[PDB]
């Protein structure tokens, strides 16, 4: 019994969560008094966090010990909890399952978590331009998390906006949810609205990206996946990075802007000396990062959300943002850019509206800005995530014997 | 004086050393009441260890100091070490060695150590199919750790089962011992049964592997080499990788089962993504790892030493195994698999009758599970290594820098 | 509002400075009595330094502050500071400058700083064959720090003996000094015949190294650039790597000897398993590192610098230095290499008459000697850094408590 799953993309330090920018939906987590924070504010949970994501207008919370906790907008199910009480939905509550949840990923208003053996739960809902298409069956949200019908353990979910994608321990990547632009890398242009001829059902029940073997026989396997807010990139075996889905600011790394349905290999990240390990995107930017500390950015300049300083203009390939110091980890919000720097440090830039990052100010940001603040101090930061008006960061005391 | 010699697969962190497995020849190190131990136990040794290796029935521990100790069977000598007094096998003794020694190899019945200045010494025997051929001369085990007449220095040294393996500091790779599966990379099959006519001097004086360099120049130069039981794996200045030996399950990552007389380019490690830094080997299979954090395994499947997953099938080309997190470092024991993290944890798979899994059972585990235990609580794993029925961990305290 | 930007380069580590070699001039800092040290020795300064930078005959430590402190020759005002009160040149003293300062870069005759904001502060002079030739105008040197802004910040500094190089936020590499040797990779026109001085001023002007892009956009740019004492190496966004400047023993990588005065795309560096991150430079040597721990060494082998082994030849193309642990760092002197190990270890080697090797005595030393002494004990090494006749080291006490 009991075969265990475990992945590189696992998060397993333990930390506090604190939370910036809009909250007038829940998403701080900070309660009903609380419906804006222009700086991080802590979010006290009963136990250590290892993972926190900002999904569109909600927030989820790994423990340590396997519980999710949820906050934020509850009217498509993302919590995934009973907030029949008035206000229960503006503090963090435990979202109840029996096994033990390894990682959790967040979208517009779906929420995803994949327990210790590799199943795969998913609640709330996805839709389109025009309005809701359901989770796993057509039209129906899922207040409750459902099983996601597959036959073999997961390793990694990754979400984007509206869609969810799945790395199984043998390399297959299986997509589901919106198809609009692309992003599920496995319908044909023909059905992307609404499943076209061939209902929504193809589009919400779990089916694997088929592609090629760049060689001669067998179809590719993949080693990791990564998700922006429409568009994904899928890391084969041998390395190639392939993107799919929107790219009308070029940010899946494309010299045109139609979207893309088929998975490209995108020629843009050819192994350089850049061995890519980390991809996030909001809706019309990327930010990604090598393995050798450096993070990146390409599509849309407006408001500053590529980082590299001001007057960038559209970029069409990855670009160095070199104003950082060395990278650990990198993450974008709808119109901005995060990076966690290797010695615990996170820099912010981009859109500055709803006051994610964490100036204390709305203005843009075109460069790089470190964040500060009381609740920064004498602590390292662990991860920071980003949804479409605030920013979940996940910090630890920086350690004094 | 003497120049003294450094290698970056040298250890120096200090550690406690953990065993777990079968203990009835004293390879445990627990002493003559303690025969078996399914979670790893504590071993007393006098001093801090900044690299511990299995042999077949032995273990071989180096000190910060420089000094070697050894416990396990001393039929053939691979102690290195006088254990007349009754039960001084079982527990730790010095070997006698009067070096600062820096690296230590272990193998079936024999042990090697490389001095400080690159000087290599050597105890025990070596054996073939047949039995006992000898050491460093025809027909003679040595009891006592004896110099290899070698007259450059080397900067590492790797055991297989049988055969040893000497990279010198200018890149010279230098084989002796059995050579009955090709293992040496320099003897003719016709001659690899205790050297033929030829006798044994043509496997045991120290000689080069030798390949006429590509782009015609002079001769192939290495920047590193490992041993799996009996096949050789050596990474050219090119950084490409070479393999000699044993491949009757495809472990060494070619097409074909016949063990390999000759050096071969293995096409199947080739990739521009994936730099080859480690590798280790059983009897019948393979693990190694790139720079990435990412563990491979190859050949033979029975029993789940591949870690590939329940119903995996032989593999011919390195295989990646998902279900890990960052991975630091990889070892195998003769039928099981292991990889350390970088987050400081161990994770084991294959065949379980030994309890060298640490789950604390002894069915097989064709996945990899996390070895936990009390010996492990609030510690980080440094190193970890595997013989035939048991395994050597090398441990810190909650690591502090 | 004065943005702030950073780098990965840029050191943030606090430490401690200790110096070895001759003092003859200041440049120990241990005062008027000091003329030489034989093993390292502690330099009082009243902050903790972040990072520390040996010129020719000067040493320039940047406080975690951002303060400077100088010691050392200041005929031609490397030291950016009052030396009129007899003595004063041979303690660290503080250069007067308003501004946080983030990283250093010093040569034979000049000394330059980058503030917090991106704009590069430079005093002293540059010199040529032929005496000197000016700092910002001809024959003009400055006691005090002159500002030098481009139309965008600069991200990182880097000296040669007499050249500076500035890599912009965009990756433009700026470059002004003496071009006699093709170091500033520019003005080829104006060494063809022609002497440097004939157009003295274009030299003392910080203007873009132009690469046209073959298969061509606009022009190449960079992600790194570093100097050795009459050459510069630059790593391209896409990883290859550049040099131009002295190659007379060819430690540029060339096939031939001649001065390089556009740059060249090395191709003795283009290796599809070796990603250059480190490069450094004396005059005839040069000591560069991949990604993987490993350093390589290249150009003239007279007196050890290469630190392959005894009899050493020439090298033209970046050959493995087989003989250390796991390499952070790199450096050069004008006739010494160092490298400085993961584990915070300093290792040492060539001429040996100046004592900058450490090792107690005035020797060469072909194969790298770790540094040792009361003042490395128990300390990690930092950095270390390199002059005509001495060495300076950053350390920390061992993270124990």
């Known amino acids: 019994k009991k ?104 979208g517009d208003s779906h929420t995803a978590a994949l327990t210790d053996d590799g199943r795969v739960f998913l609640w709330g809902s996805f839709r389109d331009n025009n309005g809701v298409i359901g989770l796993l069956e057509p039209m129906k949200k899922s207040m409750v998390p459902v099983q996601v019908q597959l036959d073999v353990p997961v390793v990694k979910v990754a979400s984007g906006n509206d869609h969810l994608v799945m790395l199984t321990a043998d390399g297959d990547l299986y997509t589901l949810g919106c198809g609009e632009q692309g992003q599920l890398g ?24 088929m592609l090629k073997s760049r060689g001669s026989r067998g179809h590719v396997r993949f080693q990791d996946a990564f998700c922006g807010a429409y568009f994904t990139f899928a890391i084969s075996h041998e390395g190639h990075v392939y993107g799919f889905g929107l790219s009308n600011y070029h940010q899946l790394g494309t010299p045109g ?57 559209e970029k069409s390939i990855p670009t160095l943002i070199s104003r950082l110091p060395a990278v650990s980890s990198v993450a974008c919000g709808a119109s901005v850019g995060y990076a966690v720097t290797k010695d615990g440090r996170v820099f912010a830039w981009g859109m500055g509206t709803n006051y994610q990052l964490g100036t204390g100010q709305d203005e843009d940001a075109w460069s790089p800005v470190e964040m500060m603040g009381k609740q920064l101090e004498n602590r390292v930061v662990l991860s920071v995530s980003s949804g479409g008006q605030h920013t979940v960061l996940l910090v630890k005391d920086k350690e004094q014997s």
Not at 190 to 206: S, Y
Not at 265 to 271: D, E, R, V
């Open 186 to 209: 496995r319908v044909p242009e023909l059905f992307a609205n609404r499943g076209g001829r061939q209902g929504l059902e193809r589009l919400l029940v779990p089916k694997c990206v």
């Open 3 to 106: 075969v265990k799953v475990s992945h590189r993309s696992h998060s397993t330090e333990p930390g506090l969560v604190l939370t910036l920018g809009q909250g007038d939906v829940g998403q701080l987590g900070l309660g009903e008094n609380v419906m804006e924070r222009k700086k991080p504010a802590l979010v006290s949970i009963p136990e250590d966090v290892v993972q926190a994501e900002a999904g569109g207008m909600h927030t989820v919370c790994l423990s340590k010990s396997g519980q999710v906790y949820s906050f934020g907008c509850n009217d498509e199910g993302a919590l995934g909890r009973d907030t029949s009480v008035e206000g229960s939905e503006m503090v963090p509550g435990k979202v109840e399952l029996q096994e033990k949840v390894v990682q959790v990923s967040a």
């Open 257 to 313: 802007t139609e979207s893309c349905f088929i998975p490209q290999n995108l020629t843009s990240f050819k192994n350089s000396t850049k061995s890519w390990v980390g991809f996030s995107g909001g809706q019309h930017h990327t930010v990604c990062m090598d393995s050798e500390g450096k993070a990146y950015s390409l599509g849309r300049a407006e408001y500053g959300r590529l980082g590299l300083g001001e007057g960038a203009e």
